[PDB]
Amino acid sequence: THTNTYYLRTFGHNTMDAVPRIDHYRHTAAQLGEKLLRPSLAELHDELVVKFGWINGVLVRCMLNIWGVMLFIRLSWIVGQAGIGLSVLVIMMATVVTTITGLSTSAIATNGFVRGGGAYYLISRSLGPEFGGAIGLIFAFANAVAVAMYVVGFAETVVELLKEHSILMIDEINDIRIIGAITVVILLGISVAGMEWEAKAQIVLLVILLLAIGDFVIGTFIPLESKKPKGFFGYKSEIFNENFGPDFREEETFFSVFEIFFPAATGILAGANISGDLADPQSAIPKGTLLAILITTLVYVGIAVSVGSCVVRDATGNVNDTIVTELTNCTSAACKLNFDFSSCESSPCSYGLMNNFQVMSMVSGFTPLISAGIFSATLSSALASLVSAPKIFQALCKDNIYPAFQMFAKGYGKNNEPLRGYILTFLIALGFILIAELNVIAPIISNFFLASYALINFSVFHASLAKSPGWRPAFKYYNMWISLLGAILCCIVMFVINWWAALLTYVIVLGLYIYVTYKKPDVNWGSSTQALTYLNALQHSIRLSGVEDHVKNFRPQCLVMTGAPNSRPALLHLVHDFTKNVGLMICGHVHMGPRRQAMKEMSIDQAKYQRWLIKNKMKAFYAPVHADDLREGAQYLMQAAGLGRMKPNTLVLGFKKDWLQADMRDVDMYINLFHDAFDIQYGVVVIRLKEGLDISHLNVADQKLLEASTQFQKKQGKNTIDVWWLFDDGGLTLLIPYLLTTKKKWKDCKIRVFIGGKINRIDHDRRAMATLLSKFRIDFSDIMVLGDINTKPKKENIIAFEEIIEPYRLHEDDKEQDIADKMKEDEPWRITDNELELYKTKTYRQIRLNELLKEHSSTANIIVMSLPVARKGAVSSALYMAWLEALSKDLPPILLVRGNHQSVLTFYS
Amino acid sequence: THTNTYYLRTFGHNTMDAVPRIDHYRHTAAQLGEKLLRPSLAELHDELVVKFGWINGVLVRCMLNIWGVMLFIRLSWIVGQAGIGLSVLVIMMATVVTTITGLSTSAIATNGFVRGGGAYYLISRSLGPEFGGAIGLIFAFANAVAVAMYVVGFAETVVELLKEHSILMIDEINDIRIIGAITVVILLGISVAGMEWEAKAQIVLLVILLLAIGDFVIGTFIPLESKKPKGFFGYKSEIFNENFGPDFREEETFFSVFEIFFPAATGILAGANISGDLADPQSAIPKGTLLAILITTLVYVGIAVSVGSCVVRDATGNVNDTIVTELTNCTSAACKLNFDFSSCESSPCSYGLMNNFQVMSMVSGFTPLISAGIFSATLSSALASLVSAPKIFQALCKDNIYPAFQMFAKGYGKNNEPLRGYILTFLIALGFILIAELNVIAPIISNFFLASYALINFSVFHASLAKSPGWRPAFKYYNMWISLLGAILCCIVMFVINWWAALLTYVIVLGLYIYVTYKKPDVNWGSSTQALTYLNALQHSIRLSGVEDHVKNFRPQCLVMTGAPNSRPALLHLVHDFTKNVGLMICGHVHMGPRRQAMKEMSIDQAKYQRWLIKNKMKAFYAPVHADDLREGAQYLMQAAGLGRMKPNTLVLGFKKDWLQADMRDVDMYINLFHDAFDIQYGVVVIRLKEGLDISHLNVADQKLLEASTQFQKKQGKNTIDVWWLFDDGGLTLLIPYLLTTKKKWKDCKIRVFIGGKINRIDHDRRAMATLLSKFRIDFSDIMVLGDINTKPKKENIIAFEEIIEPYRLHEDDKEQDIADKMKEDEPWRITDNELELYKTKTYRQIRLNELLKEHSSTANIIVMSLPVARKGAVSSALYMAWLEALSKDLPPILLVRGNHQSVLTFYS
Ligand SMILES: Nc1ncnc2c1ncn2[C@@H]1O[C@H](COP(=O)(O)OP(=O)(O)OP(=O)(O)O)[C@@H](O)[C@H]1O
Ligand SMILES: Nc1ncnc2c1ncn2[C@@H]1O[C@H](COP(=O)(O)OP(=O)(O)OP(=O)(O)O)[C@@H](O)[C@H]1O
Ligand SMILES: NS(=O)(=O)c1cc(C(=O)O)c(NCc2ccco2)cc1Cl
Ligand SMILES: NS(=O)(=O)c1cc(C(=O)O)c(NCc2ccco2)cc1Cl
Ligand SMILES: [Cl-]
Ligand SMILES: [Cl-]
Ligand SMILES: [K+]
Ligand SMILES: [K+]
Ligand SMILES: [Mg+2]
Ligand SMILES: [Mg+2]
Ligand code: NA
Ligand code: NA
């Protein structure tokens, strides 16, 4: 029926359904998605500029940042004060911390597409805005200060080089400050020039540093007799054996050495912070960072061991001190080789592995080459930090976490460059350089770095804890327990060095976290915090599902038929008063009208009203439902609403005030709602107000209605709480008012109970009731026993009730049997004469109860009375409505309660 | 119509409804007559021996138990080693701990009738069986050991009194052993004699103790020169000032003094342990315990101050006197009055406050009275402990918490008295007396008492934390924070003295708690633990209700329509595999039949199936519903099931295997269930098995069906998962198999992806799909692109489909245009020729897809394929069912998935 070419066309061209394509999931505004538009379910169902590679962008950056001052200056001192083994152990511990941090970072960076800000973006998108902003501020400031520290190191090295000659301008501190200012200006200029220039400069510095390392390694293998007077002796096993072990020749300990060394391993995130300029993160960051860490650790360990195997701790440089005669009785490591480096214990000798900070330069075949290597290392580290800080700050400011800093987010040029961030970082670094004494500052910045690492590790662990299906990290060489251990180790290490610095950093982090949480920025990124919230709720619900029910653990789980949650405020607040912190509260709303529009109406209403309830401080659940009429929607809610053991057991309704001026079908639906509630074993609570409950539409009447709506919101003075417990429903009638009095807004109100008694047994019945409610431990102010019930109500009230009921009567007696049956068939709510004759006693009881309530409980703050139960099929809906209206007419706020008839009170324990 | 009578009769005689009466809430066997019967809601709605008072039962017992050895023996030593102020401080600290414990006990004992036992009953009924059993065992053993210690103290005092004369039988330790054995036998006899006899003995002992205290107080006010050589001097401000302030003569310390004194504060629970024999608790325990504590503390403090204000720390027995008309050169308090009790700073003088342990006897005006008082105090404390232990043990054994001890709950006599418990306590006490050296044992028992007190305080705090409406304590003189502070103080105090004893007691408590929780005795007391479980679930749900939705936080919340949870095991386990630990799972069951019987059936099913699910380790929720047909119940569940944000979003049901051999109305209801799910914005998952899903009714066919049911309960093995993602439904089709692979039972299985492409573009489409799913980070083992779709399926398959569809065609073309319309109206599921002509392409697509699946995925462990969506009103129900049947048949387990069409996957972070 068609050509063979047609049968081989593109799959999906003959159907509205779309094949899965990348454009369906991309949100980027690329050509507005001309063809990347997957059809919605309704449509198918409804009736008819510069990017860097991983090598240059991550590996080189991380290596340059990690290698700093200690590479050529303080490594020898560390290997001296602590033996080869102890120094290697310190290096390995720092490397372990950094490696755990790198694994966590690689895991976090392989989940989605990272945009900008290495540590900040990852931490924020994986944990939440609070932690994200706190760590962003901390890390940015730490990098800004590290820029100054590196510049100061370079300046001090150059000043020492000048002091090696006659060149000098001012005192040492002032010369250091001048050199630091000049160097920081040069670095700022280079950084502002552009990112490609920075990359080229970094490559040059890296090659210079590698040349310096190679020069040192070559020099250590070419001993010269001239260096023999100094500590250098070549590779001798005697020196290696002697240099082992912790000869702490000063007021310093192992922990102090570790603290001194640690800043040497705090450049691992240089590549990550360039995520905004990486060609392809999720493939460059992990491998580059891990390789850089491995290379730097290997170089550190090798250099430490080599320096410790070819230099003596103490060596008194003196040409006329070698030879050591011919035969010696000296057991010293130097003595075994030559007399050089002898008699140093008493007289403090010039240098050696313990007192000289230029041993690496001396060992190297070429000294100026090592000097250039030191310069390049320090400058490279400073440049990396100075580039990293503005990127993190701009990423943090783009999110508007701190509105005051929104200025430092604008970009310049083809590639968005935070020039303002660069200027701010330059200012901070220049200030800290002008201080020129960063010895005290260093522990604080080290602790800042450790806090950032620990929060990265904790973010990985937290994400692995909340088993969100979106976690799905691409990197598969991590572990939740390893990451948790890494976070704990980071905290412990930060506390080990400068405990008070650790306390200060923790205080700062906590303060920033609290500020951000209070601010609550308007943004959600799908952090693991929300996933953990859902998982915790689910686990707690599952746990509660296995708990057996007990009478003393009973709580009122009320399904309030409120319509729009804001439509009826009085009912909502009243139900909230005895439900908050005790029992569940579901606000049920039934939507009518066309299903097509009702679906969108309910979809909007869900979010709108849940947000309204949350913002209004009411701990309720919105439960929208779409149904033809109110009765069937209530049926839906009473059958399915809730989850597990947290389902409703009480139905709360507002009184149908306008039942007289309304279609009898609506009244029938109301009474049938009552009947269904009773049928499914539900407690029923009806709240009646003189003015009504609905204020959505909203003269004198409107003002009174609004006042009634707002009445149950302030402190309820102390007037009374009248409970007319006439029938034993199981105790709910008494449990409601007690829970009311248990709240602050109702504490001043006293509960006085009304019961029906015998005329000649008033005292006995009163005592029995008092004892019964004392066993229940329900405080009461007074007990009134009424013997006037069952009396005939006044003639006027009966006449009024009859006049009210006349319109809805059937008058079967005065009509033909067939006509009466036909009338009752299509109007089932009609009141039959037989039922009126049968229940004249109940009608008189309702009227007399209204009389008694008016006479006695006419000044109560709120009234709780037993709700009459009409046998289904025996009493008409109109008769039930008339009973309810007569019972509670012309009264202050009243509640009609009819419990499950299962006991909800107990005097046993 | 009625006389004056019948108008003033008892309220409630003319109605089935009952007035509230205590008989309605009493559950005791007696008083269950017709009068004390509350009518059920259905019945109203359906269509037509010795008891002690608080004084002698609690106050006297508590006072006698609290007062023990230290009252007349070591109080002087305590006031000596420490100062008056420090001794008062230790007394006040112990009293504070005991007073907080007493407040907590009175709070816990005023929350209903306490049946029997002592602290065990209160702790169990307020906290749970685990804590109850642990504390019961600990407390009973502690009381038995305390009996042993009191007997040992009495024996030691009597042995010392004998040594004061020329009376002795064997070595001191052996004589102590004989005296202790005799005393314990006498105490056991007295206790077994009854309880009234014990009360009379206790009253006699209390009178003797009061006489002894009065004798001491009288003696301290009548100084005699004979006792002047001893430390006694009468009241003198010089001695008071001298004795004020610590003087730790020996290797003692404040903490050691506190540890020595603390056992003096125990015994506050003697009255509460006789709760089963009190006239009424909730009125005797609180007041009696508090008054006893107050009186004992006042007496302790007064005696301490009096002894420290009228006796010198060091004194000499040399009657020769001192300061015989000499000059006053010494500032010692003794010199102020006379030289007596001086000059023993180097040599150890005879006795005094520091050295003598009978100063109270000497100070008193009649030593034999003080000796009798010591005897009475020790004997009364021992008797109280020996009575308390068996009561607690019997209460613990009556609950069957430890089945091995069920034999000790038996009672004897008119009043249930545990004789076996008495014998066991006597045996334990006799053994510990035979040890005769309880110095090392005292700290352990002290820590046991402290643990009991701390857990009482923690029970009060926990009850106040779980805001159960049944808490309602009658004693309104406590505080949750005060009780928590008391528990913490008890723990800290127990750890302060004998830290290793505290660790041992904590280990024992933890072990007993773990054993009880593992055993999980079948008991339900309505503890604070269950209330806290409910409250925690509610709070977590409320918190989750305020969390905004995100694509990466999406979870599959599946409303699996399974009927009876055990009826279809394969479907339940399959849904559990990709829902456990990730997303919600509600098992929906629809009940049909008469409403009256259906309600009871659903009520039974709720408990039965929730228990079955919990016992079978399935984290699902049972959701019963009563409706006329399956569609109505599914509508109920899809509209109302769930709570807050934890509500279903995916519909899972089994394939209607027997649709061909079934009424077309049922098939129409099935297809309309599909349509309703799509309309309500639900994802739909259909699971089809060759043999079916139902195994409730269950030859070869039955065996195969059972094997299919059990197939998915084991480890899958090195099979493959075939995903035919043909249409972009949002990613659910791919999300489900990934979640399957996330679990251990599906680790081996690898995901194979099938997509539709164009011939001559296979490589490009395969690369694009691989890239797209690599950005999603879902691992795959291979990607197959099929270009042979849209081709005409074999003639035989089309003929078979036509033959299958024949009995449901409308055949409108060969009709009169009126009979056809009538048939369509009567049976809307009829397949019209117009729709068949329109969707021949879709039919051929289904047939060819089945061909491709059989040819390619015939060996997959499980198949996931996109579920075709039929436009509502355009495709008949019969045609939709035929499409589904043709698409899947003669295939391994297959899942048809049609997501919400909202994206559930993302490559952004
Ligand atoms: N969607 C709904 N529409 C109307 N009433 C609802 C709805 N959902 C629950 N209800 C409950 O059913 C009752 C019906 O009252 P109705 O509006 O028929 O009489 P009314 O005198 O207008 O009441 P109100 O003063 O509350 O408007 C309300 O009090 C309300 O609590
Ligand atoms: N109360 C229920 N009664 C019947 N089916 C239900 C019910 N609740 C949910 N369902 C789902 O609807 C499907 C209807 O199956 P049906 O009663 O037609 O028997 P079937 O086609 O032989 O399949 P099965 O082997 O599951 O019985 C079931 O697979 C089941 O998953
Ligand atoms: N102690 S040091 O001179 O060898 C040293 C060495 C280095 C270094 O990077 O090797 C270093 N980096 C900057 C830094 C400080 C805190 C965190 O990072 C700082 C210092 Cl003080
Ligand atoms: N230290 S004491 O001799 O004055 C003493 C005194 C008492 C006493 O009850 O006064 C006491 N009661 C029994 C007990 C031990 C642990 C807990 O309770 C035990 C002792 Cl050892
Ligand atoms: Cl870093
Ligand atoms: Cl006690
Ligand atoms: K570094
Ligand atoms: K005691
Ligand atoms: Mg209205
Ligand atoms: Mg079936
Ligand atoms: Na560097
Ligand atoms: Na005693």
Short mmCIF file of C-alpha atoms and ligand atoms in Angstrom, two decimals, chain A residues 63-68 209 376-378 380-381, ligand 11:
data_model
loop_
_atom_site.label_atom_id
_atom_site.label_comp_id
_atom_site.label_asym_id
_atom_site.label_seq_id
_atom_site.Cartn_x
_atom_site.Cartn_y
_atom_site.Cartn_z
CA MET A 63 50.22 20.89 41.06
CA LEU A 64 51.22 24.56 41.04
CA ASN A 65 48.87 25.42 43.90
CA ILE A 66 49.95 22.50 46.08
CA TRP A 67 53.67 23.24 45.70
CA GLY A 68 54.54 26.39 47.61
CA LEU A 209 59.92 24.60 39.12
CA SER A 376 58.27 30.28 40.61
CA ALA A 377 56.67 27.97 43.18
CA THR A 378 55.59 30.82 45.43
CA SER A 380 52.46 30.09 40.98
CA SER A 381 50.72 29.34 44.29
NA NA C 11 53.13 26.86 43.98
#
